[PDB]
mmCIF file of C-alpha atoms and ligand atoms in Angstrom:
data_model
loop_
_atom_site.group_PDB
_atom_site.id
_atom_site.type_symbol
_atom_site.label_atom_id
_atom_site.label_comp_id
_atom_site.label_asym_id
_atom_site.label_seq_id
_atom_site.Cartn_x
_atom_site.Cartn_y
_atom_site.Cartn_z
ATOM 1 C CA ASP A 1 -15.773 8.157 -9.273
ATOM 2 C CA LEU A 2 -13.640 5.015 -9.727
ATOM 3 C CA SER A 3 -15.253 1.982 -8.044
ATOM 4 C CA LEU A 4 -14.605 -1.660 -7.182
ATOM 5 C CA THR A 5 -18.115 -2.776 -8.187
ATOM 6 C CA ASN A 6 -16.946 -4.570 -11.306
ATOM 7 C CA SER A 7 -14.438 -6.631 -9.347
ATOM 8 C CA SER A 8 -14.473 -10.400 -9.722
ATOM 9 C CA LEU A 9 -12.622 -10.971 -6.445
ATOM 10 C CA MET A 10 -14.491 -8.733 -4.003
ATOM 11 C CA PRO A 11 -17.230 -11.315 -3.464
ATOM 12 C CA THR A 12 -14.767 -14.042 -2.492
ATOM 13 C CA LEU A 13 -12.134 -11.993 -0.752
ATOM 14 C CA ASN A 14 -11.802 -12.083 3.039
ATOM 15 C CA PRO A 15 -14.236 -9.565 4.689
ATOM 16 C CA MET A 16 -11.451 -7.364 6.167
ATOM 17 C CA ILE A 17 -9.853 -6.944 2.754
ATOM 18 C CA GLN A 18 -13.326 -6.046 1.445
ATOM 19 C CA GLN A 19 -13.698 -3.390 4.122
ATOM 20 C CA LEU A 20 -10.209 -2.040 3.501
ATOM 21 C CA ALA A 21 -10.687 -1.849 -0.273
ATOM 22 C CA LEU A 22 -14.045 -0.130 0.267
ATOM 23 C CA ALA A 23 -12.506 2.165 2.891
ATOM 24 C CA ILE A 24 -9.550 2.900 0.592
ATOM 25 C CA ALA A 25 -11.950 3.621 -2.243
ATOM 26 C CA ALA A 26 -14.032 6.050 -0.187
ATOM 27 C CA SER A 27 -10.790 7.848 0.608
ATOM 28 C CA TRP A 28 -9.389 8.150 -2.926
ATOM 29 C CA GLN A 29 -12.690 9.375 -4.336
ATOM 30 C CA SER A 30 -12.544 12.496 -2.140
ATOM 31 C CA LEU A 31 -9.393 13.043 -4.166
ATOM 32 C CA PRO A 32 -9.039 14.396 -7.754
ATOM 33 C CA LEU A 33 -8.158 11.013 -9.300
ATOM 34 C CA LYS A 34 -6.777 10.588 -12.795
ATOM 35 C CA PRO A 35 -5.933 7.299 -14.513
ATOM 36 C CA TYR A 36 -2.438 5.875 -14.128
ATOM 37 C CA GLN A 37 -1.042 3.659 -16.862
ATOM 38 C CA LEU A 38 0.106 0.168 -15.935
ATOM 39 C CA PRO A 39 1.208 -2.300 -18.647
ATOM 40 C CA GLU A 40 -1.989 -3.257 -20.468
ATOM 41 C CA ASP A 41 -1.586 -6.979 -19.690
ATOM 42 C CA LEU A 42 -1.033 -6.436 -15.949
ATOM 43 C CA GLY A 43 -4.350 -4.775 -15.076
ATOM 44 C CA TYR A 44 -5.956 -8.193 -14.738
ATOM 45 C CA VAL A 45 -3.848 -11.299 -14.349
ATOM 46 C CA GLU A 46 -4.811 -14.970 -14.198
ATOM 47 C CA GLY A 47 -2.677 -18.069 -13.854
ATOM 48 C CA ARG A 48 -2.083 -21.390 -12.125
ATOM 49 C CA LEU A 49 -0.048 -22.336 -9.096
ATOM 50 C CA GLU A 50 0.188 -25.838 -7.654
ATOM 51 C CA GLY A 51 -2.849 -26.556 -9.784
ATOM 52 C CA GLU A 52 -4.957 -23.769 -8.313
ATOM 53 C CA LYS A 53 -6.243 -20.661 -10.072
ATOM 54 C CA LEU A 54 -4.710 -17.281 -9.218
ATOM 55 C CA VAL A 55 -6.039 -13.870 -10.088
ATOM 56 C CA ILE A 56 -4.988 -10.290 -9.457
ATOM 57 C CA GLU A 57 -6.650 -6.937 -10.045
ATOM 58 C CA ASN A 58 -4.465 -3.872 -10.113
ATOM 59 C CA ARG A 59 -6.125 -0.481 -9.970
ATOM 60 C CA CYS A 60 -4.024 2.623 -10.584
ATOM 61 C CA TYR A 61 -4.630 6.344 -10.239
ATOM 62 C CA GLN A 62 -2.809 9.652 -9.885
ATOM 63 C CA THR A 63 -3.194 13.323 -8.860
ATOM 64 C CA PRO A 64 -0.811 16.306 -8.970
ATOM 65 C CA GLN A 65 0.081 15.325 -5.390
ATOM 66 C CA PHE A 66 0.554 11.611 -6.066
ATOM 67 C CA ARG A 67 2.706 10.066 -8.790
ATOM 68 C CA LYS A 68 1.057 6.644 -8.627
ATOM 69 C CA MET A 69 -1.691 5.248 -6.356
ATOM 70 C CA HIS A 70 -1.851 1.450 -6.529
ATOM 71 C CA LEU A 71 -4.589 -0.897 -5.266
ATOM 72 C CA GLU A 72 -3.792 -4.575 -5.659
ATOM 73 C CA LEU A 73 -6.235 -7.408 -4.978
ATOM 74 C CA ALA A 74 -5.491 -11.070 -5.547
ATOM 75 C CA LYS A 75 -6.646 -14.568 -4.754
ATOM 76 C CA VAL A 76 -4.144 -17.375 -5.027
ATOM 77 C CA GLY A 77 -5.580 -20.817 -4.487
ATOM 78 C CA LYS A 78 -8.336 -21.530 -1.973
ATOM 79 C CA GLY A 79 -6.251 -19.881 0.725
ATOM 80 C CA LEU A 80 -4.027 -16.868 0.141
ATOM 81 C CA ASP A 81 -6.049 -13.637 0.033
ATOM 82 C CA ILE A 82 -4.077 -10.448 -0.574
ATOM 83 C CA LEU A 83 -4.755 -6.732 -0.384
ATOM 84 C CA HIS A 84 -1.969 -4.339 -1.320
ATOM 85 C CA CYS A 85 -2.141 -0.579 -1.467
ATOM 86 C CA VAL A 86 0.460 2.136 -1.898
ATOM 87 C CA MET A 87 0.196 5.846 -2.623
ATOM 88 C CA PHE A 88 3.230 7.207 -4.435
ATOM 89 C CA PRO A 89 3.804 10.913 -3.682
ATOM 90 C CA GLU A 90 4.892 13.367 -6.387
ATOM 91 C CA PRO A 91 8.357 14.436 -5.043
ATOM 92 C CA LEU A 92 7.634 18.148 -5.498
ATOM 93 C CA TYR A 93 5.215 18.048 -2.570
ATOM 94 C CA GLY A 94 7.298 16.163 -0.026
ATOM 95 C CA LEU A 95 4.495 13.983 1.328
ATOM 96 C CA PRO A 96 5.031 10.573 2.992
ATOM 97 C CA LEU A 97 3.981 7.536 1.031
ATOM 98 C CA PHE A 98 1.040 5.565 2.372
ATOM 99 C CA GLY A 99 1.061 1.787 2.305
ATOM 100 C CA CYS A 100 -0.790 -1.181 3.761
ATOM 101 C CA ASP A 101 -1.161 -4.909 3.122
ATOM 102 C CA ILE A 102 -3.549 -7.639 4.175
ATOM 103 C CA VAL A 103 -2.666 -11.291 4.006
ATOM 104 C CA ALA A 104 -5.369 -13.776 4.846
ATOM 105 C CA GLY A 105 -6.343 -17.366 4.280
ATOM 106 C CA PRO A 106 -9.018 -19.902 5.328
ATOM 107 C CA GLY A 107 -8.487 -19.138 9.021
ATOM 108 C CA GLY A 108 -8.772 -15.370 8.837
ATOM 109 C CA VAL A 109 -6.217 -12.614 8.613
ATOM 110 C CA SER A 110 -2.629 -13.642 9.266
ATOM 111 C CA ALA A 111 -1.113 -10.182 8.814
ATOM 112 C CA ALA A 112 -2.394 -6.615 8.613
ATOM 113 C CA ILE A 113 0.210 -3.863 8.047
ATOM 114 C CA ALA A 114 -0.364 -0.125 7.510
ATOM 115 C CA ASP A 115 1.886 2.921 7.604
ATOM 116 C CA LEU A 116 2.791 6.415 6.418
ATOM 117 C CA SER A 117 6.450 6.203 5.362
ATOM 118 C CA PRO A 118 9.115 8.990 5.547
ATOM 119 C CA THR A 119 10.115 10.099 2.045
ATOM 120 C CA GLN A 120 12.639 12.415 3.689
ATOM 121 C CA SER A 121 16.379 11.844 3.495
ATOM 122 C CA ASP A 122 16.318 11.755 7.292
ATOM 123 C CA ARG A 123 13.464 9.231 7.617
ATOM 124 C CA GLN A 124 11.264 11.732 9.446
ATOM 125 C CA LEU A 125 7.630 12.597 8.813
ATOM 126 C CA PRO A 126 6.467 16.218 8.476
ATOM 127 C CA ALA A 127 5.720 17.992 11.762
ATOM 128 C CA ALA A 128 2.023 18.079 10.882
ATOM 129 C CA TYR A 129 1.727 14.324 10.349
ATOM 130 C CA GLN A 130 3.302 13.695 13.764
ATOM 131 C CA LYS A 131 1.003 16.216 15.418
ATOM 132 C CA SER A 132 -2.008 14.322 14.011
ATOM 133 C CA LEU A 133 -0.719 10.764 14.285
ATOM 134 C CA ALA A 134 -0.027 11.447 17.952
ATOM 135 C CA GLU A 135 -3.427 13.049 18.585
ATOM 136 C CA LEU A 136 -5.078 9.855 17.325
ATOM 137 C CA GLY A 137 -4.096 7.890 20.400
ATOM 138 C CA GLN A 138 -2.302 4.601 21.028
ATOM 139 C CA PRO A 139 -3.445 1.580 18.937
ATOM 140 C CA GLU A 140 -4.368 -1.352 21.199
ATOM 141 C CA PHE A 141 -4.003 -4.723 19.468
ATOM 142 C CA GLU A 142 -3.031 -8.132 20.789
ATOM 143 C CA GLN A 143 -0.631 -9.354 18.071
ATOM 144 C CA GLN A 144 2.039 -6.949 16.794
ATOM 145 C CA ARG A 145 5.651 -6.047 15.898
ATOM 146 C CA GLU A 146 8.538 -8.060 14.357
ATOM 147 C CA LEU A 147 9.452 -5.606 11.584
ATOM 148 C CA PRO A 148 12.666 -6.811 9.879
ATOM 149 C CA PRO A 149 16.020 -4.909 9.943
ATOM 150 C CA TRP A 150 15.178 -3.342 6.575
ATOM 151 C CA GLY A 151 12.231 -1.737 8.330
ATOM 152 C CA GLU A 152 14.490 1.312 8.247
ATOM 153 C CA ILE A 153 12.139 2.293 5.408
ATOM 154 C CA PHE A 154 8.942 2.687 7.441
ATOM 155 C CA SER A 155 7.887 5.237 10.063
ATOM 156 C CA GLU A 156 7.308 4.948 13.806
ATOM 157 C CA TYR A 157 3.527 4.827 13.672
ATOM 158 C CA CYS A 158 3.617 1.605 11.664
ATOM 159 C CA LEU A 159 0.827 -0.716 12.737
ATOM 160 C CA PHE A 160 1.843 -4.332 12.053
ATOM 161 C CA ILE A 161 -0.824 -6.459 13.679
ATOM 162 C CA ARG A 162 -2.119 -9.995 13.292
ATOM 163 C CA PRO A 163 -5.850 -9.492 14.005
ATOM 164 C CA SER A 164 -6.862 -11.433 17.117
ATOM 165 C CA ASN A 165 -10.584 -11.139 16.245
ATOM 166 C CA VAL A 166 -13.305 -9.273 14.285
ATOM 167 C CA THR A 167 -13.275 -6.385 16.747
ATOM 168 C CA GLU A 168 -9.652 -5.552 15.907
ATOM 169 C CA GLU A 169 -10.277 -6.078 12.185
ATOM 170 C CA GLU A 170 -12.498 -2.983 12.113
ATOM 171 C CA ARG A 171 -10.231 -1.125 14.510
ATOM 172 C CA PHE A 172 -7.375 -1.553 12.095
ATOM 173 C CA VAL A 173 -9.590 -0.418 9.229
ATOM 174 C CA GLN A 174 -10.580 2.644 11.277
ATOM 175 C CA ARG A 175 -6.927 3.405 11.990
ATOM 176 C CA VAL A 176 -6.140 2.996 8.292
ATOM 177 C CA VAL A 177 -9.106 5.235 7.512
ATOM 178 C CA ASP A 178 -7.714 7.756 10.019
ATOM 179 C CA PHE A 179 -4.261 7.869 8.376
ATOM 180 C CA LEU A 180 -5.883 8.332 4.995
ATOM 181 C CA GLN A 181 -7.908 11.314 6.197
ATOM 182 C CA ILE A 182 -4.845 12.967 7.766
ATOM 183 C CA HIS A 183 -2.987 12.184 4.544
ATOM 184 C CA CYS A 184 -5.728 13.493 2.233
ATOM 185 C CA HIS A 185 -5.829 16.714 4.200
ATOM 186 C CA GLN A 186 -2.069 17.268 4.207
ATOM 187 C CA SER A 187 -2.510 16.567 0.503
ATOM 188 C CA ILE A 188 -4.639 19.626 -0.290
ATOM 189 C CA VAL A 189 -2.535 21.962 1.840
ATOM 190 C CA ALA A 190 0.727 20.671 0.424
ATOM 191 C CA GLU A 191 3.076 23.060 -1.340
ATOM 192 C CA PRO A 192 5.948 22.771 -3.845
ATOM 193 C CA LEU A 193 9.301 22.121 -2.180
ATOM 194 C CA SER A 194 12.583 23.618 -3.369
ATOM 195 C CA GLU A 195 14.041 21.854 -6.414
ATOM 196 C CA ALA A 196 16.770 20.586 -4.104
ATOM 197 C CA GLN A 197 14.217 18.789 -1.942
ATOM 198 C CA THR A 198 11.858 17.636 -4.714
ATOM 199 C CA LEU A 199 14.832 15.367 -5.461
ATOM 200 C CA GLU A 200 15.664 14.102 -1.949
ATOM 201 C CA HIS A 201 12.009 13.039 -1.775
ATOM 202 C CA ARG A 202 12.772 11.745 -5.259
ATOM 203 C CA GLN A 203 15.468 9.812 -3.409
ATOM 204 C CA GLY A 204 13.268 8.414 -0.660
ATOM 205 C CA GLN A 205 10.484 7.110 -2.876
ATOM 206 C CA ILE A 206 13.217 5.871 -5.248
ATOM 207 C CA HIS A 207 15.013 4.143 -2.337
ATOM 208 C CA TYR A 208 11.655 2.907 -1.029
ATOM 209 C CA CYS A 209 10.610 1.104 -4.209
ATOM 210 C CA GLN A 210 14.105 -0.341 -4.664
ATOM 211 C CA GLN A 211 14.123 -1.691 -1.081
ATOM 212 C CA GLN A 212 10.599 -3.120 -1.309
ATOM 213 C CA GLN A 213 11.486 -4.468 -4.748
ATOM 214 C CA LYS A 214 14.131 -6.650 -3.085
ATOM 215 C CA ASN A 215 12.307 -7.857 0.032
ATOM 216 C CA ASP A 216 8.598 -7.933 -0.906
ATOM 217 C CA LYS A 217 7.672 -11.620 -0.981
ATOM 218 C CA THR A 218 4.984 -11.251 -3.621
ATOM 219 C CA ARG A 219 7.858 -12.191 -5.936
ATOM 220 C CA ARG A 220 8.579 -15.800 -4.977
ATOM 221 C CA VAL A 221 4.932 -16.700 -5.595
ATOM 222 C CA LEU A 222 4.907 -14.894 -8.961
ATOM 223 C CA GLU A 223 8.039 -16.825 -9.911
ATOM 224 C CA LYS A 224 6.382 -20.173 -9.155
ATOM 225 C CA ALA A 225 3.302 -19.245 -11.148
ATOM 226 C CA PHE A 226 4.960 -17.448 -14.064
ATOM 227 C CA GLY A 227 8.694 -17.560 -13.438
ATOM 228 C CA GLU A 228 11.609 -15.197 -12.832
ATOM 229 C CA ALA A 229 11.320 -12.857 -15.823
ATOM 230 C CA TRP A 230 7.603 -12.277 -15.361
ATOM 231 C CA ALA A 231 7.984 -11.782 -11.610
ATOM 232 C CA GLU A 232 10.777 -9.259 -12.149
ATOM 233 C CA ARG A 233 8.752 -7.222 -14.642
ATOM 234 C CA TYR A 234 5.775 -7.210 -12.246
ATOM 235 C CA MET A 235 7.818 -6.149 -9.168
ATOM 236 C CA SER A 236 9.508 -3.165 -10.843
ATOM 237 C CA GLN A 237 6.577 -2.167 -13.040
ATOM 238 C CA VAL A 238 3.560 -2.787 -10.824
ATOM 239 C CA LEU A 239 4.397 -2.964 -7.144
ATOM 240 C CA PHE A 240 7.355 -0.652 -6.664
ATOM 241 C CA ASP A 241 8.357 0.921 -9.955
HETATM 242 CL CL1 CL B 301 13.854 -14.040 -0.141
#
C-alpha cells in the first residue's frame, strides 16, 4: 500500500482530519496507485510564520483513471490545522474530480467541505453519479452553505458544513467515505470517451485548477511565510497544476 504511518503531523493534527486522512487512505488503497511526481522540495515543507513553525506533507499518486491524486496535510502555528485532498481525473475517462478540505484550530473544526465536481463542459455529473448521490439520502448538518459566486465550479451535492459537534464530524467523514466508494466504483467501470470529449473534460479540470488557483486562500499564508514567488510555484505546481 501507501500509508500515512510515517507522518510527523498525524499525531498532532485535529482528530477529524486524522479520520479523514485515514478514511481517504483506505479508499485510495483499494485503487491501483502509482507514484506521482511533485517537485522534490515540495513533498515536505517547513517554515516560519509570525514566529511559529509551519509544516506540510504532500502525498501524490496516480492511476490510469486519475491524472493526479493529492493529499495535503499541514500545521501552521499552534492553531491552523489543514487537510486538503483532490483527485484529478484523466480526461479520457470523463470522471468528476473529487475534493475536500478541513480547516481546524484550537476550538475544533471551523470548516469541512467535500464534493464531486463536474468536469463536463455543462457542469453536470454523469447520470450514474446522480443516481447514487441521490440514493444516499439528505445530509443533515447544523452549519452549512455560503459557497461564493465562483462556486460555479462545484456540483450540487457539495457538503460545506461547519461541524456543530463530534457526532457530525463522523457523519461528514462517512459521507466523504460514501462519495469515495461511489467514485472508486465508477472508476473501474469507466470507459474511454471520444477524443472530442477527452478534451472538454481536459477543459473542465483545466478550468477547475485555474479557478481554484485564483481563489484558494492557501496562497496568502504561503506568501507571508515564503513570499509571492514561492506561493505561486506551490499553487500551480502542487495544489491545482
Ligand atoms: Cl484574495
